[PDB]
């Protein structure tokens, strides 16, 4: 099992949820690039683990539900079995982990993605170790319910200009918006 990482899109007000859903209208290319980061394995012949609250599973659309090309796992306390198009169900973060640890996944997974809500973030930056946070900032204000954690400048590193990321502004539907990596390794 490689590494720990999360992504994010993020409003100017640390919103990431409104209602479980985007508090912004969809994005497309930034859903596209949200794709290519977390279906790209760093292992040849691996796939990468998707880790997310059942409210992300729902609002992505049914019909692209399993995520294609990664393996899907959903994390609740609430729900009794998987949610239908997903096959694996943990309680939290470090059960999700243990998992991964276990004959069915040991030998197929590369990175961890965790891709929201609130609590499961929360869950892999509380978590010891490398973590990679991919950070799309979505430049205005939008009406949220839940949050995102702040991001400790003490012990996280801003990694200007990252590889394989666009640098400059971004836009859609008169959305600005811009990718930051961080990192922390402890
Ligand atoms: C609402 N939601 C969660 C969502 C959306 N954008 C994000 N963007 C970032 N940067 N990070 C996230 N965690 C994130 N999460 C969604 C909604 C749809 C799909 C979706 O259909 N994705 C497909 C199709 C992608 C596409 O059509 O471009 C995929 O293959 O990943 C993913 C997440």
Redesign the pocket.
Known sequence: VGSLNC???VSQNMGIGKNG??PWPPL?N??????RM??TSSVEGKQNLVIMGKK?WF???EK?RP??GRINLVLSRELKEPPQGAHFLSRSLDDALKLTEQPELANKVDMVWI??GSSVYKEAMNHPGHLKL?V?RIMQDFESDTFFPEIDLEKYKLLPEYPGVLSDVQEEKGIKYKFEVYEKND
Request: glycine content about 4%; aromatic content about 12%; cysteine-free.
């Open positions: 992504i994010v899109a859903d985007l497309r930034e859903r596209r690039y949200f794709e977390t279906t992300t609002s992505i659309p692209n995520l294609k891709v929201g991919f799309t």
